């Protein structure tokens, strides 16, 4: 007998270079028990505690003239307050100095447990999609699990 | 009454050289309700939504650049292909010692007979200081 | 199904909440398979002179020895943030106790919790 818990695990679209496009229609991605993917956002079908999680992976070749700040932010748009409240975020600086040019890899991971309401819209956003790495699958993903 | 959910929590072997070797014959390690451990892979006994998870802990004594990787993969019987579900790549860098835990998890639709691997590139960098540091599991929902 | 999910409060890591919370420890009420999970978040401002290691550990106090179930270590060395995630499935006994602890409650900061679910 299947579980009735709302869950989702969506993944970056690897041919959408220069963007972060979440897919549920791809090998090993899923929407279940009422969770929708609408306008690049996950939509919560019932109230409760959810674990939210996400990973993005950034990659560059050597360090450029201008200072690089990589961010990843998960936000919540409630029906009763329809503007992005940040739930989780992290900043990373992959580069100490300008390359005086080996690859660097900087992942950012965000997870937490939050109360959510029906109709909640969750977004998972980066500032620099030009540094995303879509080399193989499994690197960039976003999901929720009702507790 | 005991739960009939397929479950597994397997643990890395501290004395397998140049290898990430999963064990279930240890304390607080576990195969139950159909899950098998064959060729270092966990084998699913039935269709369903599963939680899947793995931790690995890397440790180096200083910095000369090193890349660390950690990947959970699926092989579906029906497709006979090997495909990543979760994957992390990470540059960790008198010599003071660094630690890098990588914890991979998510929920997935799995089919009867699927085989799952949890793999890294630098077994020489695994740390076994304490128990509980390197592990691999699945939980039917 | 027995479930708990507790969270932090200073000075220490104290958990404010048919699973009981006796002595900052969750107490198993029946024998079976449990999913157990936790996270903690550490904050500092700048790097100290003495080398700091942050650990986080979930232990099973059986029924009376004490053994790691899940554990990890981070080395942080401009403000910084380092989380630590733990989670897995375990066969437990009626009356076993579970601790989720850290070594440096001084660097402790949604993201700080501990819980178990009977499967
Ligand atoms: C993404 C993921 C997949 C599998 C597992 C075992 C975990 C472990 N876990 C953790 C763990 O701190 C973590 C790990 C990775 N991302 C976010 C959090 N917190 C949890 C908080 C809650 C739960 C939880 C409670 N019920 N269910 C069905 C899952 C698990 C939780 C995380």
From Swiss-Prot, chain B:
Q: What is this protein called?
A: Tumor necrosis factor, soluble form
Which residue ranges does the entry give as Extracellular-facing topology?
1-141
UniProt-reported outcome of changing residue 26 to W: Biologically inactive
Q: List the disulfide bonds.
A: 63-93
- Domain called THD: residue spans: 6-141
Tell me the outcome of changing residue 83 to A/D: Biologically inactive
Phenotype when changing residue 78 to F: Biologically inactive
Q: Where does the protein end up?
A: Secreted
| Section of the entire sequence shown | 83 to 233 of 233
* Native organism: Homo sapiens
UniProtKB/Swiss-Prot annotation, chain C:
Q: What is the effect of changing residue 67 to A/D?
A: Biologically inactive
Extracellular compartment segments: 1-119
UniProt subcellular location: Secreted
Q: Which residues form the THD domain?
A: 2-119
Q: Which cysteines are joined by disulfide bonds?
A: 47-77
Name of this protein: Tumor necrosis factor, soluble form
> Which species does this protein come from?
Homo sapiens (Human)
Q: Quick one: which gene encodes this? A: TNF
Q: What range of the parent protein does this fragment cover?
A: 87 to 233 of 233
């Amino acid at each position: 007998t299947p579980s009735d818990k709302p869950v989702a695990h969506v993944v970056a679209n690897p041919q959408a270079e220069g963007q972060l496009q979440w897919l549920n229609r791809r090998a090993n991605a899923l929407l279940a028990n009422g969770v929708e993917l609408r306008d690049n956002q996950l939509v919560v079908p019932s109230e409760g505690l959810y674990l939210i999680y996400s990973q993005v992976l950034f990659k560059g070749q050597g360090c450029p003239s201008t200072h690089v700040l990589l961010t990843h932010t998960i936000s919540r748009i409630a029906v009763s307050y329809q503007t992005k409240v940040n739930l989780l975020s992290a900043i990373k600086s992959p580069c100490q100095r300008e390359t005086p040019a080996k690859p660097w890899y900087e992942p950012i991971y965000l997870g937490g447990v939050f109360q959510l309401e029906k109709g909640d819209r969750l977004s998972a956003e980066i500032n620099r999609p030009d540094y995303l790495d879509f080399a193989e699958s499994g690197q960039v993903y976003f999901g929720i699990i009702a507790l």
